[PDB]
UniProtKB/Swiss-Prot annotation:
This is Low molecular weight phosphotyrosine protein phosphatase. The keyword Membrane does not apply. Belongs to the low molecular weight phosphotyrosine protein phosphatase family. It comes from Bos taurus (Bovine). The modification N-acetylalanine is found at residue 1. It comes from the Eukaryota. Keywords: Acetylation, Cytoplasm, Hydrolase, Phosphoprotein, Protein phosphatase. Interacts with EPHA2; dephosphorylates EPHA2. Interacts with EPHB1. Interacts with the SH3 domain of SPTAN1. InterPro entries: LMW_PTPase, Ptyr_pPase, Ptyr_pPase_sf, Tyr_Pase_low_mol_wt_mml, Tyr_phospatase_low_mol_wt. CDD domains: LMWPTP (cd16343). Changing residue 62 to S: 2.5-fold increase in activity. Its EC number is 3.1.3.48, 3.1.3.2. Inhibited by sulfhydryl reagents.
């Protein structure tokens, strides 16, 4: 079992509710497919407001309900991210304009930046901020994440 190494960065505004869920769903898929060793995975924020913070408690419990754990600490997206990751997947059109803006300040930008929801077989393009929502909204984000992450993986696998 030998291949090449792929990397993906999951991105949200704060890296406290959405991307940590995406990122953790993503590792599980990869681990379950016995391909971890070929993947570098990470999650980051457009904003610095919450760096160093743990994931929101409702995101932790949501993942737990699904047999998944995370140990992530929020971090900000940097310019190196644009040259180090194959893919940068974000949650919403805002994250998307924000990143295209930064990447510009990047000379040899080698990351492909897209909406994770662009991979959704159900077509729900956007992954909504569940911050002000309830446990049900966390769950629906998880759900989207699984759909989108399996769809992305079968294609870059
Ligand atoms: O981490 Mo977020 O950008 O509040 O879902």
């Amino acid at each position: 079992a030998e291949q090449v190494t792929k990397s993906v960065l999951f991105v949200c505004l704060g890296n406290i509710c959405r991307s940590p869920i995406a990122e953790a769903v993503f590792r599980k898929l990869v681990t379950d497919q016995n391909i971890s060793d070929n993947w570098v995975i990470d999650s980051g924020a457009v904003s610095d407001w919450n760096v160093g913070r743990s994931p929101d408690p409702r995101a932790v419990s949501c993942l737990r309900n699904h047999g998944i754990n995370t140990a992530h600490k929020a971090r900000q997206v940097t310019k190196e991210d644009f040259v180090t990751f194959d893919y940068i997947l974000c949650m919403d059109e805002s994250n998307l304009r924000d990143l295209n803006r930064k990447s510009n300040q990047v000379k040899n930008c080698r990351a492909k930046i897209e909406l994770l929801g662009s991979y959704d077989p159900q077509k729900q393009l956007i992954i909504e901020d569940p911050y002000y929502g309830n446990d049900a909204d966390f769950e629906t984000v998880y759900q989207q994440c699984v759909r989108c992450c399996r769809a992305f993986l079968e294609k870059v696998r």
